[PDB]
């Protein structure tokens, strides 16, 4: 079919909320009505384009589903399906493809409501961004504000343990059941001694998380950060960023899977912040993916003042 954006008009455009914390499952929604001005055929389609600051998928990853996010059918005013929808992760564009519905009608009216999330990579810092959305070649302007919970967290002492992390991608569609997680080791960039980091596939009870952390289920890459002030708030981290120096090879025989569902990492005495990128898997029990990372250390000078900090992750799913 043909692109029929000039034949479709969106109205009553609404954004549920303009300010939120994407590190606390903050998201928003967009709702609009549309009407087909002219007659169109089955197969014809119209689109919506998100701006740089937004994504239609958030922390759900569709890279194993051809980078294409399936969307719930779009309905007429009358409750029947007018269009089947698809979201393209790469171009951040929804494509609404008219069904046979449209073949015997005129004056077709529909509406949709779709969740919207931050783009962790293009809005990596707290602040305000242009959230201008394009629907059927028309602009609907907004301002988005992200108050990210700071990744810089830890015991409040110059030599205290400090660590955080965020699950930034979960593949719930393909059946492969993968997840990507960023861990910031020592984000306060303190001088710490005998530092250990534990990446757990669960929080307090093994049976309560679908996480699966092991030598066969998990891959880790470790980066020494050069300038900590460049690090994101969104937990996005580019493994090819020149601000990151890969040291995975140095940790080759310093990562242990001595315990179930747990990756132990021996950092030792450190004075720089690290990024640990985790690619993992979760099981088929239908339990939530619930993780916890823990860093422990002592004062590098007195070998006393033991300290330990934990950080929990879990994600939520929204519907349109």
């Amino acid at each position: 079919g043909t692109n029929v954006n000039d034949k479709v008009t969106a109205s009553n455009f609404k954004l549920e909320k303009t300010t939120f914390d994407p590190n606390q499952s903050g998201n928003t929604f967009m709702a609009a009505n549309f009407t087909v001005t002219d007659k169109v055929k089955s197969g014809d389609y119209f689109t919506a384009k998100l701006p740089d600051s937004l994504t239609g998928n958030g922390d759900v990853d569709y890279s194993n589903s051809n980078n294409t996010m399936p969307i719930a059918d779009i309905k007429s005013t009358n409750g029947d399906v007018v269009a089947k929808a698809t979201y393209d992760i790469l171009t951040k564009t929804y494509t609404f493809v008219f069904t046979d519905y449209v073949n015997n009608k005129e004056n077709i009216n529909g509406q949709f409501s779709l969740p919207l999330f931050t783009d962790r990579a293009k809005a990596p810092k707290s602040g305000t961004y242009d959230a201008n959305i394009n629907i059927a070649d028309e602009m609907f302007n907004n301002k988005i504000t992200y108050n990210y919970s700071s990744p810089i967290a830890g015991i409040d002492k110059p030599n205290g343990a400090n660590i955080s992390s965020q699950i930034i991608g979960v593949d719930t569609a393909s059946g492969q059941n993968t997840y990507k997680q960023t861990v910031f080791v020592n984000p306060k960039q303190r001088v710490l001694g005998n530092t250990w980091v534990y990446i757990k596939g669960y929080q307090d009870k093994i049976e309560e998380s679908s996480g699966k952390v092991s030598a066969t289920d998990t891959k880790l890459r470790i980066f020494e950060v050069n300038d900590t002030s460049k690090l994101s708030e969104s937990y996005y981290a580019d493994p090819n960023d020149s601000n990151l120096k890969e040291v995975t090879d140095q940790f080759k025989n310093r990562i242990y899977y001595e315990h179930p569902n747990v990756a132990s990492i021996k950092f030792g005495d450190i004075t720089k912040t690290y990024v640990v990128l985790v690619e993992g898997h979760y099981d088929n029990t239908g339990k939530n993916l619930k993780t916890q990372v823990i860093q422990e250390n002592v004062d590098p000078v007195t070998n006393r003042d033991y300290s330990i900090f934990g950080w929990n992750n879990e994600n939520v799913v929204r519907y349109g």
Binding site: P22, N23, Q24, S25, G26, N27, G56, N57, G58, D59, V60, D61, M69, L114, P115, F117, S149, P151, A153, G154, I155, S164, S165, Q166, I167, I168, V170, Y235, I308, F309, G310, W311, N312, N313, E314, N315, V316, V317, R318, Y319, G320
Partner: peptide, 11 residues
């Protein structure tokens, strides 16, 4: 001994 957490979301 202390801690916090964060949470994400998607569709």
């Amino acid at each position: 001994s202390s801690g916090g957490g964060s949470s994400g979301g998607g569709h």
